[PDB]
Symmetry: C6
Subunit: 30 residues, 6 copies
């Protein structure tokens, strides 16, 4: 169903934001 697909896509979004957070941490640390 589409609500589950939406939940799954939000999970993917959370994962990409976690990647952004880590890269921004690396910029900050530098």
């Amino acid at each position: 169903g589409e609500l589950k697909a939406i939940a799954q896509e939000l999970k993917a979004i959370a994962k990409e934001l976690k990647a952004i957070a880590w890269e921004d941490k690396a910029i900050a640390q530098g």
Copy 2:
């Protein structure tokens, strides 16, 4: 249910964005 799953994923997203804000703060500082 999937509506709760969606709300929980949005909660995770809010938490990652708080992390990003914290790292960007550190970028501004350095």
Copy 3:
């Protein structure tokens, strides 16, 4: 209900994006 919880989480997301915008503004200024 869960729709209200989703609207709430979106509000928290908007709040964090405002913090990000203010930090990116600080990076730009410096």
Copy 4:
């Protein structure tokens, strides 16, 4: 209704991301 509230919060979110893009452009110019 909460669906309208959700649409409104997504509108606020789009507005914040436009503000972020503006500052990131200024960072790029610097």
Copy 5:
């Protein structure tokens, strides 16, 4: 309807994230 309004606001958010990716590219370039 509000579901279409939500889909249209998500399309606006994607467009803004595109702009952010483009400016981050410009930052990485310089």
Copy 6:
């Protein structure tokens, strides 16, 4: 239907965030 349109726009958002992560990675490297 609009729930599929929403899921599709969330997919486009995840794709743009993957692009931001990659550009921020490039900034971190630089």
